[PDB]
Design a protein around this nucleic acid. Structure first.
Ligand SMILES: [Cl-]
Ligand SMILES: [Cl-]
Ligand SMILES: [Cl-]
Ligand SMILES: [Cl-]
Ligand SMILES: [K+]
Ligand SMILES: [Mg+2]
Ligand SMILES: [Mg+2]
Ligand SMILES: [Mg+2]
Ligand SMILES: [Mg+2]
Ligand SMILES: [Mg+2]
Ligand SMILES: [Mg+2]
Ligand SMILES: [Mg+2]
Ligand SMILES: [Mg+2]
Ligand SMILES: [Mg+2]
Ligand SMILES: [Mg+2]
Ligand SMILES: [Mg+2]
Ligand SMILES: [Mg+2]
Ligand SMILES: [Mg+2]
Ligand SMILES: [Mg+2]
Ligand SMILES: [Mg+2]
Ligand SMILES: [Mg+2]
Ligand SMILES: [Mg+2]
Ligand SMILES: [Mg+2]
Ligand SMILES: [Mg+2]
Ligand code: NA
Ligand code: NA
Ligand code: NA
Ligand code: NA
Ligand code: NA
Ligand code: NA
Ligand code: NA
Ligand code: NA
Ligand code: NA
Ligand code: NA
Lengths: 92, 194, 237, 56
RNA sequence: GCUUUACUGCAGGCUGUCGCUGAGGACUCUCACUCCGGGAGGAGGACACCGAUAGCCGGGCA
RNA sequence: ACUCGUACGGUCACUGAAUCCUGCCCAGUGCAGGUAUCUGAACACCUCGUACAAGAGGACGAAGGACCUGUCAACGGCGGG
RNA sequence: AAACAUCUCAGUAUCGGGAGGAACAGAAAACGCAAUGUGAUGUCGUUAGUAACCGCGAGUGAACGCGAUACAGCCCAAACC
């Protein structure tokens, strides 16, 4: 589906409607320093590694909308529930 | 002033440098041709030996023991085992090489008792340790106030029961506080969990 | 499964061992201080159970009596010589260097003084080709060019018993008798005629290898069977 | 040939015999080892914890 | 029990790296080390072996 | 162990005396060889990060793979129109 | 664990080596109710199924301290001779 790059709507921070800019959430890079990372290293050994021997699941036919809404004036973003969309394209 | 001994010690802080380096390069050639347990007239590291209880006296013996380097020499399982227990290559023994050396020496001298031991180097495939043993039955020692304790009946086969210094550190008894919950008073009384 | 036959072999049990206690001599060249003054006389020509070929007994000047890898054309009474100054005739042993090229040789040492390793079976022979102050090139019976230390001793002539491979065994019994004199399990059951548990080719409603026979060099024992690291198979091209 | 009765006829070989060390007829005269006390194999007397219930 | 391109691992093989290991991206040497030689000495030589680790193969096995 | 053995050897397999013979197929799988280029781990090396460290990235790149070739008395195949 | 691989059964069964009438431990490179505080070590009661671990599933699981029992502190190496 199509969607405006910018549009007026409620900013939960200013607590008042203002122009926002929609953008897809780019994945952040991991640091390999979280507790789970330490448990992986520490708990993996000889033979099967339990949960750490498992491998990546799969994919649902269509994914949900993963967007960031940025307030045009206070510059802060907020998140919203997403909706299944095979494809999402912005307008302008 | 500095004791002459401090020079032997000081040299062994870096067995790979200077004169000691060239000495080792030479000795190991002969050591590699000696047995598994060779009695020697004099400690290769006087300061260390004396520091551990050595004494130029009747009933005091020293022996260099050679032991292979590396992990456990283990046979792969011949029956059912869950993956966790199918290992062979990465398994290491819980007794350190120095302790293995101390035992081989004591067995060689059935009548003697291990007093202590220290390392004298290694090449690419074996480690050498010199073990100090004592004759608990020689009056020279029985009358020595600094050693006669090792004469007592309860010190018999002390090495095989981990009463050696190396045996006690290996048993995780160094710390008197945090971390030694399952080591002191013994590994066995704590259900073998250390 | 169970260990395959190839694996039972390595244990060296009776069935796989050679009847060593029934063998005659460990054929090796003599050790000479130097000079060449070592000559001996052929006293008898005996049969060598380990090689199915003849061997010659020789008494040396210094009283030493030993059996020797006998080349073709050597008889009782003949005088053999071993050393640098050895003459150049059949049966005499001397370092490759002292040997004239183009001359067939046998029982060649791989390392000087090892007593001989190459070209020792019935009727075979090595062929000294090149000389040098450094390397002596020899052509072994397999056809390979081998660079050898010219100081490596060898025997002049071709090994005795040539042509043994020319006559067929004709019957199982003959194979049997020969096989009994070797460290080998015989007869041979085809893998494909066994049960899966016993061999990688075992099993099936009919007999055929369950997979391709060409196996990798890296395959483990118990699995390395069939055509080992074959660079090719068949007769085509 | 049956592996039962007919094969019992060839059994006239002597193996286990009265042991010099423990007195049990367990000294294998071919192996020169007692299957009971370990004589011929061990200076120490043969014994195992599985010879009784674990907690006993 | 058996099979395999089932899941997960474990031996084994190949390969890089570190230790043993030294002198002057290709090279010489000799002193460790290995082997041949009764010995003298020869060959090989900082490689191979062995110890450690990494990638690939891996129903041979669990 | 083979081996008191050394390619006229002996290991691993297939077929199964003699006689007349044994066609076509290398795409897949297997094995083997080669390989500009691509891919390819760890150590050491470089950068960023951290008064250190974790960590991120770079350069280099072995076997192996991609890719090319050889091979069916190698696994096997020899159809519809 | 209602399968099962980590986990669990369990450092159990069993095996190898060895001591004593008891073993082992033991006079802090401790503790860390953080203190102007405690004061070798075992053990008992408790702390507590607490902290901690764990396909964060099933399960697993201490310590300091406290109340008790009993109490005991010393010898070398080296410096200088
Ligand atoms: Cl989206
Ligand atoms: Cl002892
Ligand atoms: Cl044959
Ligand atoms: Cl306190
Ligand atoms: K289990
Ligand atoms: Mg693992
Ligand atoms: Mg106790
Ligand atoms: Mg021989
Ligand atoms: Mg034939
Ligand atoms: Mg036979
Ligand atoms: Mg057959
Ligand atoms: Mg059948
Ligand atoms: Mg099979
Ligand atoms: Mg058939
Ligand atoms: Mg067939
Ligand atoms: Mg029966
Ligand atoms: Mg040798
Ligand atoms: Mg299976
Ligand atoms: Mg048939
Ligand atoms: Mg269950
Ligand atoms: Mg569950
Ligand atoms: Mg537990
Ligand atoms: Mg605490
Ligand atoms: Mg004093
Ligand atoms: Na851990
Ligand atoms: Na002893
Ligand atoms: Na532990
Ligand atoms: Na088959
Ligand atoms: Na093909
Ligand atoms: Na092909
Ligand atoms: Na169940
Ligand atoms: Na089940
Ligand atoms: Na777990
Ligand atoms: Na209190």
């Amino acid at each position: 589906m199509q969607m405006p790059r910018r549009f007026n709507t409620y900013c939960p921070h200013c607590n008042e409607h203002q122009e926002h800019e929609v953008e897809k959430v780019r994945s952040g890079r991991q640091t390999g320093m979280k507790w789970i990372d330490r448990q992986r290293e520490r708990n993996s050994g000889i033979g099967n590694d339990g949960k750490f021997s498992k491998v990546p699941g799969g994919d649902k036919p269509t994914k949900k909308t993963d967007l960031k809404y940025r307030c045009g004036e206070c510059g802060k973003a907020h998140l919203r529930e997403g909706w299944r969309a095979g494809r999402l394209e912005f307008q302008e | 002033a500095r004791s002459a001994y401090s020079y032997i010690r000081d040299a062994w802080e870096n067995p790979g440098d200077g004169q000691l380096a060239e000495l080792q390069w030479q000795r190991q050639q002969e050591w590699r041709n000696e047995g598994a347990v060779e009695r020697i007239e004099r400690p290769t590291r006087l300061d260390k030996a004396r520091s551990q209880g050595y004494k130029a006296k009747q009933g005091v013996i020293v022996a260099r023991v050679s032991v292979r380097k590396g992990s456990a020499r283990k046979r792969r399982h011949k029956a059912g085992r869950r993956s966790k227990r199918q290992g062979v290559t990465r398994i290491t023994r819980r007794k350190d090489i120095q302790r293995v050396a101390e035992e081989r020496a004591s067995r060689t001298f059935p009548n003697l008792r291990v007093l202590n031991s220290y390392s004298v180097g290694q090449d690419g495939r074996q480690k050498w340790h010199e073990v100090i043993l004592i004759d608990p039955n020689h009056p020279a020692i029985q009358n020595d106030d600094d050693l006669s304790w090792i004469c007592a009946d309860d010190q018999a086969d002390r090495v095989f029961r981990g009463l050696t210094g190396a045996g006690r550190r290996n048993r995780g008894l160094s710390g008197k506080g945090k971390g030694s919950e399952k080591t002191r008073p013994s590994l066995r009384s704590n259900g073998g969990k250390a | 499964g169970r260990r395959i036959q190839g694996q039972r072999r390595g244990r060296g049990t009776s069935t796989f061992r050679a009847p060593s206690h029934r063998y005659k001599a460990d054929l090796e060249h003599r050790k000479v201080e130097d000079g060449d003054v070592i000559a001996g006389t052929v006293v008898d020509i005996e049969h060598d159970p380990a090689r199915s070929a003849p061997v010659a007994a020789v008494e040396f000047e210094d009283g030493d009596r030993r059996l020797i890898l006998a080349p073709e054309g050597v008889g009782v009474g003949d005088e053999l010589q071993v050393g640098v100054s050895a003459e150049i005739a059949p049966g005499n042993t001397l370092p490759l260097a002292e040997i004239p090229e183009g001359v067939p040789v046998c029982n060649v040492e791989s390392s000087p003084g090892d007593g001989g390793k190459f070209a020792r079976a019935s009727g075979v022979n090595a062929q000294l080709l090149t000389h040098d102050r450094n390397v002596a090139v020899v052509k072994l019976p397999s056809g390979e060019m081998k660079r050898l230390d010219p100081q490596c001793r060898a025997t002049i002539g071709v090994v005795a018993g040539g042509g043994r491979t020319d006559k067929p065994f004709v019957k199982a019994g003959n194979k049997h008798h020969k096989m009994k004199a070797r460290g080998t399990k015989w007869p041979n059951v085809r893998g494909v005629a066994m049960n899966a548990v016993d061999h990688p080719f075992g099993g099936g409603g009919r007999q055929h290898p369950g997979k391709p026979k060409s196996i990798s060099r890296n395959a483990p024992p118990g699995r390395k069977v069939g055509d080992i690291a074959s660079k090719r198979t068949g007769r085509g091209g | 040939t049956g592996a039962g009765t007919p094969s019992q006829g060839k059994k006239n070989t002597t193996t286990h015999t009265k042991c010099r060390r423990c007195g049990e007829k367990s000294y294998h005269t071919k192996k020169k080892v007692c299957s009971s006390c370990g004589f011929g194999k061990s200076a120490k007397r043969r014994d195992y914890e599985w010879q009784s219930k674990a907690g006993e």
